[PDB]
């Protein structure tokens, strides 16, 4: 199909825009929520060997403050990504001076490339997402409360007020889909605001482990 492909690409684009905005980046307001027809007009309405193919819509976004760091998003052509395919993206990144980036894989990544992604973590950070992960913004789900990443100063304030250590906070997985959505690293407290039927509002905290 071709209309299904452009709908899927538009939904992935919308979810990536919302992900960048929730992550704290410069997302243009009309780009943040554009019509499917607007996407088809801007890109070509034929993903099947046509104008809105992959690598055309690699979204480059900067940070809201400190506009240096960017994570210009990647869309591989092939379903199953490999090392010799991600090394081209590594070449494009080392051509630049920016270390973060997101790749949107179609099928599963080869596990050797999964190890390779970790094999450059101190140098430059790479996150990967499957198509099914980006067809729905899970933060819009009613079961998912408001996750907010906390700054280090706020973490110090929290630990000093409650007189507890980072070892004592209830924790959260690094492979958590919400944690992957915000792209938080290990040791980064996330405040969670959720409505409670007994107190109104409850703010919990989840250190990342």
């Amino acid at each position: 199909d071709d209309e299904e492909e452009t709908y899927r690409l538009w939904k992935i684009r919308k979810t990536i825009m919302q992900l960048c905005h929730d992550r704290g980046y410069l997302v243009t307001q009309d780009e943040l929520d554009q019509t499917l027809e607007e996407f088809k007009a801007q890109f070509g309405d034929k993903p099947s060997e046509g104008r809105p193919r992959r690598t055309d819509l690699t979204v480059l976004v900067a940070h809201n403050d400190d506009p240096t760091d960017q994570m210009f998003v990647f869309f591989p052509e092939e379903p199953k990504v490999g090392i010799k395919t991600i090394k081209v993206y590594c070449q494009r990144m080392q051509e630049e001076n920016i270390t973060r980036a997101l790749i949107v894989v179609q099928q599963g990544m080869t596990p050797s490339a999964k190890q390779s992604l970790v094999d450059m973590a101190p140098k430059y950070i790479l996150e990967q997402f499957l198509q099914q992960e980006l067809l729905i913004n899970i933060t819009e789900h009613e079961l998912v409360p408001e996750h907010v990443v906390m700054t280090k100063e706020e973490v110090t304030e929290l630990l000093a007020r409650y007189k507890l250590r980072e070892n004592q906070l209830p924790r959260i997985q690094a492979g958590d889909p919400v944690a992957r959505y915000f792209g938080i690293k290990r040791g980064q407290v996330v405040k969670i605001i959720r409505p409670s039927e007994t107190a109104g509002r409850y703010i919990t905290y989840r250190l990342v482990q």
Partner: protein, 550 residues
Amino acid sequence: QDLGVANGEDLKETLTNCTEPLKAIEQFQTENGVLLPSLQSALPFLDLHGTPRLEFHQSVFDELRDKLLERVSAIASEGKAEERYKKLEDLLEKSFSLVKMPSLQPVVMCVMKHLPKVPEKKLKLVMADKELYRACAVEVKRQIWQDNQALFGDEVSPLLKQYILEKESALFSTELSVLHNFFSPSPKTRRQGEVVQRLTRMVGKNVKLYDMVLQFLRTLFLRTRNVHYCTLRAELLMSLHDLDVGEICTVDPCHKFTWCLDACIRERFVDSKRARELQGFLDGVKKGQEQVLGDLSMILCDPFAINTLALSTVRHLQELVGQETLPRDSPDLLLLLRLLALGQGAWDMIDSQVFKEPKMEVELITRFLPMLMSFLVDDYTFNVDQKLPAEEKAPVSYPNTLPESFTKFLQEQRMACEVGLYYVLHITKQRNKNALLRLLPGLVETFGDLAFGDIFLHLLTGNLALLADEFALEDFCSSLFDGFFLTASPRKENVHRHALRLLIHLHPRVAPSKLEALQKALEPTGQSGEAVKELYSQLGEKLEQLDHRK
């Protein structure tokens, strides 16, 4: 006391005279009152009221006037065109004698507003009266302007001057920001400016007025050499496009080209598909319609179009470096260069009336561009060498020598100068201080002093704000200021203003000795303009505040 009208003049007399004839006065009201028998029986109730008989009649008159205005609008909206226009013409013929009556003037003005063609005698009478002309709606003013080019020019020239002043002031904003610069606003946002909206409202659907505005823009572009007139041409055409004015968009040969270029400007990049669409628009110019090429070059002379095309050219050069390919073998790069050549040669093409595409110099493609690619190549190898393990680190010094041929290309070729200036902006945005210092001496002498233009200097200062920590080094500040800014500031006031803005923004990070030296070197003279003195005073205030923070 006009046609069948009793005292306005003898009304002033009636207010001055004051002796006695009561029955004459009463007969005058009876003859010149609301001549309805049904009102004669109702008047004693008003007499039985107590409030003087002026507010009631004024309220009734205002309500009748408003109902008449509503009915004029309804007639203009409903029915067959010929019948409604004939009714409006009859009403105008009956009511035009009261055009100077303030209470009934709105009715006449509305009737004239809804008429497709007002009679020429009434239009001349309105033109002869300044207040009547001012009170007229833009629809009547269009019928006046279409046959009076001088009056339309008098109405339009202040707007054009205001547009130029607004663009220049935007170039000299106090805030230095890479994120919020002259090219930050989207085209749709730019078309919302007061001048563009007012010009679009004045033109409306009148093709003749649009052609007059285009002629004014061409004449001012030739006379003043200001490219923001080209910007205004593009924005006015696209503003008419946003209002679905098909009477103008269908006859303008640049409409589709300007639309595609507007999309490219919005995306800040020209892809292969959009490039091919623009090429198809260019190659579609038929023999005998070559003046359309001059118009298209004027569209391409827009600073936004030039910025988008040059940034796309630099990005394509980087991609060619990545792909191990030569500039001559890339059709998209050649197409971008062709568009840039047309944009740069717009002024010469319009002035000489020779509507032919400028010949792109061979040495540009075959020599200058691959040398820029070699600069990129040196940057990449230096960056890779700096990341090698310490056991393999040879003492690699960054290449600081600028080839003489590169400087000659910047001095003698306009296109090479433009591409090199945008490459300098690109490397400065990447915080590559070594490449910036390598290329800076070649910017002192450039083609037509393009390196000292306000657009380039605005972008350059904005990007230099990203290198704020490097201003603590005396060598970096000496290079930048002494070798580039101070070489031209005594001869160019705009360079002085840009240097003052940069210093005002970055004074907390400049070395104190160099800061004092720059404050002395940038001191305004007796011949300096008011803006330079104001910027210098602001710098002094900031320095005093910084000293107080010790």
